[PDB]
Protein backbone atom coordinates (compact mmCIF):
# COMPACT_ATOMS: atom_id res chain seq x y z
CA UNK A 1 0.00 0.00 0.00
CA UNK A 2 2.70 2.46 1.04
CA UNK A 3 4.53 1.41 -2.12
CA UNK A 4 1.36 2.06 -4.13
CA UNK A 5 0.98 5.53 -2.65
CA UNK A 6 4.62 6.26 -3.49
CA UNK A 7 4.34 5.15 -7.11
CA UNK A 8 0.98 6.94 -7.38
CA UNK A 9 2.45 10.22 -6.14
CA UNK A 10 5.38 9.94 -8.55
CA UNK A 11 2.94 9.13 -11.36
CA UNK A 12 1.01 12.33 -10.67
CA UNK A 13 4.30 14.19 -10.74
CA UNK A 14 4.88 12.73 -14.19
CA UNK A 15 1.32 13.34 -15.47
CA UNK A 16 1.33 16.98 -14.34
CA UNK A 17 4.82 17.44 -15.81
CA UNK A 18 3.44 16.39 -19.19
CA UNK A 19 0.32 18.53 -18.82
CA UNK A 20 2.44 21.57 -17.99
CA UNK A 21 4.70 20.85 -20.94
CA UNK A 22 1.82 20.40 -23.39
CA UNK A 23 0.07 23.58 -22.21
CA UNK A 24 3.32 25.54 -22.33
CA UNK A 25 5.17 24.26 -25.39
CA UNK A 26 2.60 22.59 -27.65
CA UNK A 27 -0.10 25.24 -27.98
CA UNK A 28 -0.37 28.38 -30.08
CA UNK A 29 -1.75 30.54 -27.27
CA UNK A 30 -0.76 29.57 -23.72
CA UNK A 31 -3.71 29.22 -21.35
CA UNK A 32 -2.02 30.65 -18.25
CA UNK A 33 -4.81 29.68 -15.84
CA UNK A 34 -4.59 26.08 -17.01
CA UNK A 35 -0.81 26.15 -16.58
CA UNK A 36 -1.09 27.55 -13.05
CA UNK A 37 -3.59 24.79 -12.17
CA UNK A 38 -1.33 21.98 -13.30
CA UNK A 39 1.65 23.67 -11.62
CA UNK A 40 -0.25 23.67 -8.32
CA UNK A 41 -1.04 20.01 -8.91
CA UNK A 42 2.61 19.33 -9.78
CA UNK A 43 3.76 20.89 -6.48
CA UNK A 44 1.16 19.00 -4.46
CA UNK A 45 2.31 15.73 -5.99
CA UNK A 46 6.00 16.45 -5.41
CA UNK A 47 5.33 17.33 -1.75
CA UNK A 48 3.47 14.03 -1.51
CA UNK A 49 6.19 11.99 -3.21
CA UNK A 50 8.82 13.53 -0.93
CA UNK A 51 6.66 12.86 2.12
CA UNK A 52 5.84 9.26 1.23
CA UNK A 53 9.41 8.32 0.31
CA UNK A 54 10.59 9.69 3.67
CA UNK A 55 8.06 7.53 5.49
CA UNK A 56 9.11 4.51 3.45
CA UNK A 57 12.74 5.07 4.40
CA UNK A 58 11.99 5.44 8.11
CA UNK A 59 9.84 2.31 7.81
CA UNK A 60 12.76 0.23 6.52
CA UNK A 61 14.85 1.34 9.52
CA UNK A 62 12.06 0.56 11.96
CA UNK A 63 11.55 -2.87 10.46
CA UNK A 64 15.16 -3.89 11.16
CA UNK A 65 14.95 -2.37 14.61
CA UNK A 66 11.72 -4.21 15.45
CA UNK A 67 13.12 -7.46 14.06
CA UNK A 68 16.08 -7.08 16.40
CA UNK A 69 13.62 -7.00 19.28
CA UNK A 70 11.66 -9.94 17.86
CA UNK A 71 14.84 -12.02 17.54
CA UNK A 72 15.71 -11.19 21.17
CA UNK A 73 12.37 -12.58 22.29
CA UNK A 74 12.89 -15.67 20.15
CA UNK A 75 16.09 -16.51 22.05
CA UNK A 76 13.78 -17.98 24.71
CA UNK A 77 12.13 -20.53 22.42
CA UNK A 78 13.38 -24.09 22.94
Amino acid sequence: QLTKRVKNAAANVLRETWLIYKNTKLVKKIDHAKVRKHQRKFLQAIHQARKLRSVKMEQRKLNDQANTLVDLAKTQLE
Partner: protein, 147 residues
Protein backbone atom coordinates in the same frame (compact mmCIF):
# COMPACT_ATOMS: atom_id res chain seq x y z
CA UNK B 1 -12.50 12.29 -26.75
CA UNK B 2 -15.46 10.80 -24.88
CA UNK B 3 -17.99 11.20 -27.71
CA UNK B 4 -17.80 11.23 -31.51
CA UNK B 5 -18.70 14.41 -33.36
CA UNK B 6 -21.51 14.57 -35.90
CA UNK B 7 -18.89 14.64 -38.68
CA UNK B 8 -17.04 11.57 -37.37
CA UNK B 9 -20.34 9.68 -37.11
CA UNK B 10 -21.09 10.50 -40.77
CA UNK B 11 -17.56 9.46 -41.77
CA UNK B 12 -17.91 6.18 -39.88
CA UNK B 13 -21.21 5.66 -41.65
CA UNK B 14 -19.20 5.78 -44.90
CA UNK B 15 -16.60 3.44 -43.39
CA UNK B 16 -19.30 0.85 -42.64
CA UNK B 17 -19.75 0.28 -46.38
CA UNK B 18 -16.12 -0.82 -46.65
CA UNK B 19 -17.01 -3.88 -44.56
CA UNK B 20 -20.61 -4.41 -45.63
CA UNK B 21 -19.67 -5.81 -49.02
CA UNK B 22 -23.21 -6.61 -50.15
CA UNK B 23 -24.81 -3.43 -48.87
CA UNK B 24 -27.44 -5.28 -46.82
CA UNK B 25 -26.82 -3.13 -43.71
CA UNK B 26 -25.08 -5.83 -41.69
CA UNK B 27 -21.50 -7.09 -41.51
CA UNK B 28 -21.22 -10.89 -41.47
CA UNK B 29 -18.34 -13.25 -40.67
CA UNK B 30 -18.07 -14.01 -44.41
CA UNK B 31 -17.65 -10.31 -45.19
CA UNK B 32 -14.93 -9.88 -42.55
CA UNK B 33 -13.14 -12.81 -44.22
CA UNK B 34 -13.29 -11.04 -47.58
CA UNK B 35 -12.06 -7.80 -46.02
CA UNK B 36 -9.17 -9.41 -44.16
CA UNK B 37 -8.00 -11.38 -47.19
CA UNK B 38 -8.13 -8.22 -49.29
CA UNK B 39 -5.74 -6.72 -46.71
CA UNK B 40 -3.34 -9.67 -47.01
CA UNK B 41 -4.36 -11.72 -43.98
CA UNK B 42 -6.10 -15.09 -43.71
CA UNK B 43 -7.86 -15.45 -40.34
CA UNK B 44 -9.44 -18.78 -39.39
CA UNK B 45 -13.22 -19.08 -39.28
CA UNK B 46 -13.05 -18.98 -35.49
CA UNK B 47 -11.00 -15.78 -35.51
CA UNK B 48 -13.49 -14.12 -37.88
CA UNK B 49 -16.37 -15.19 -35.61
CA UNK B 50 -14.53 -13.77 -32.59
CA UNK B 51 -14.24 -10.43 -34.37
CA UNK B 52 -17.96 -10.41 -35.07
CA UNK B 53 -18.83 -11.54 -31.53
CA UNK B 54 -16.83 -8.83 -29.78
CA UNK B 55 -18.86 -6.15 -31.59
CA UNK B 56 -22.24 -7.93 -31.96
CA UNK B 57 -23.89 -6.47 -28.85
CA UNK B 58 -27.36 -7.90 -29.55
CA UNK B 59 -26.02 -11.37 -30.36
CA UNK B 60 -27.95 -11.78 -33.60
CA UNK B 61 -24.76 -12.86 -35.35
CA UNK B 62 -24.01 -9.85 -37.55
CA UNK B 63 -22.82 -6.28 -36.99
CA UNK B 64 -25.22 -3.42 -37.72
CA UNK B 65 -24.28 0.25 -38.01
CA UNK B 66 -25.05 1.30 -34.40
CA UNK B 67 -22.99 -1.64 -33.09
CA UNK B 68 -20.10 -0.73 -35.40
CA UNK B 69 -20.38 2.92 -34.41
CA UNK B 70 -20.40 2.19 -30.70
CA UNK B 71 -17.29 0.07 -31.03
CA UNK B 72 -15.60 2.75 -33.13
CA UNK B 73 -16.43 5.42 -30.51
CA UNK B 74 -14.73 3.29 -27.88
CA UNK B 75 -11.71 2.74 -30.13
CA UNK B 76 -11.37 6.44 -30.92
CA UNK B 77 -11.50 7.23 -27.22
CA UNK B 78 -8.79 4.66 -26.43
CA UNK B 79 -6.62 5.73 -29.36
CA UNK B 80 -6.74 9.35 -28.27
CA UNK B 81 -5.53 8.49 -24.74
CA UNK B 82 -2.86 6.10 -25.98
CA UNK B 83 -1.67 8.66 -28.55
CA UNK B 84 -1.32 11.36 -25.90
CA UNK B 85 0.79 9.02 -23.79
CA UNK B 86 3.03 8.24 -26.77
CA UNK B 87 3.37 11.95 -27.44
CA UNK B 88 4.52 12.45 -23.85
CA UNK B 89 6.94 9.51 -24.08
CA UNK B 90 8.62 10.87 -27.21
CA UNK B 91 9.24 14.21 -25.50
CA UNK B 92 10.74 12.71 -22.33
CA UNK B 93 12.77 10.25 -24.39
CA UNK B 94 14.81 13.00 -25.99
CA UNK B 95 17.24 10.85 -27.98
CA UNK B 96 14.54 8.47 -29.23
CA UNK B 97 16.39 5.36 -28.02
CA UNK B 98 13.36 3.95 -26.17
CA UNK B 99 14.62 4.66 -22.66
CA UNK B 100 14.07 7.73 -20.54
CA UNK B 101 17.27 8.28 -18.59
CA UNK B 102 17.60 10.26 -15.36
CA UNK B 103 19.42 12.92 -17.38
CA UNK B 104 16.58 13.22 -19.90
CA UNK B 105 13.97 13.55 -17.15
CA UNK B 106 16.05 16.25 -15.51
CA UNK B 107 16.11 18.20 -18.75
CA UNK B 108 12.34 18.11 -19.01
CA UNK B 109 11.92 19.48 -15.49
CA UNK B 110 14.65 22.04 -15.84
CA UNK B 111 13.20 23.33 -19.09
CA UNK B 112 9.84 23.73 -17.38
CA UNK B 113 11.55 25.76 -14.67
CA UNK B 114 10.93 23.13 -12.00
CA UNK B 115 13.35 22.79 -9.07
CA UNK B 116 14.03 19.13 -8.33
CA UNK B 117 17.25 17.78 -6.84
CA UNK B 118 19.26 15.41 -9.04
CA UNK B 119 18.58 12.88 -6.28
CA UNK B 120 14.84 13.53 -6.62
CA UNK B 121 14.88 13.01 -10.39
CA UNK B 122 16.76 9.73 -9.72
CA UNK B 123 14.11 8.57 -7.26
CA UNK B 124 11.32 9.19 -9.79
CA UNK B 125 13.15 7.05 -12.34
CA UNK B 126 13.59 4.23 -9.83
CA UNK B 127 9.90 4.33 -8.94
CA UNK B 128 8.78 3.87 -12.54
CA UNK B 129 11.66 1.48 -13.24
CA UNK B 130 10.08 -1.99 -13.13
CA UNK B 131 12.89 -4.04 -14.69
CA UNK B 132 15.63 -2.35 -12.67
CA UNK B 133 17.81 -1.22 -15.58
CA UNK B 134 17.83 2.35 -14.26
CA UNK B 135 15.80 3.77 -17.16
CA UNK B 136 12.14 4.12 -18.14
CA UNK B 137 11.06 2.25 -21.26
CA UNK B 138 7.75 2.69 -23.07
CA UNK B 139 5.80 -0.02 -21.21
CA UNK B 140 7.03 1.22 -17.84
CA UNK B 141 6.06 4.73 -18.87
CA UNK B 142 2.57 3.65 -19.90
CA UNK B 143 2.00 1.97 -16.53
CA UNK B 144 3.04 5.17 -14.78
CA UNK B 145 0.93 7.45 -16.96
CA UNK B 146 -2.21 5.31 -16.56
CA UNK B 147 -1.85 4.22 -12.92
Amino acid sequence: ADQLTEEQIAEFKEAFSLFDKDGDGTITTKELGTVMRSLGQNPTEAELQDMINEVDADGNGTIDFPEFLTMMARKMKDTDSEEEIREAFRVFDKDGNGYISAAELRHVMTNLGEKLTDEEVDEMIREADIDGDGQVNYEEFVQMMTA
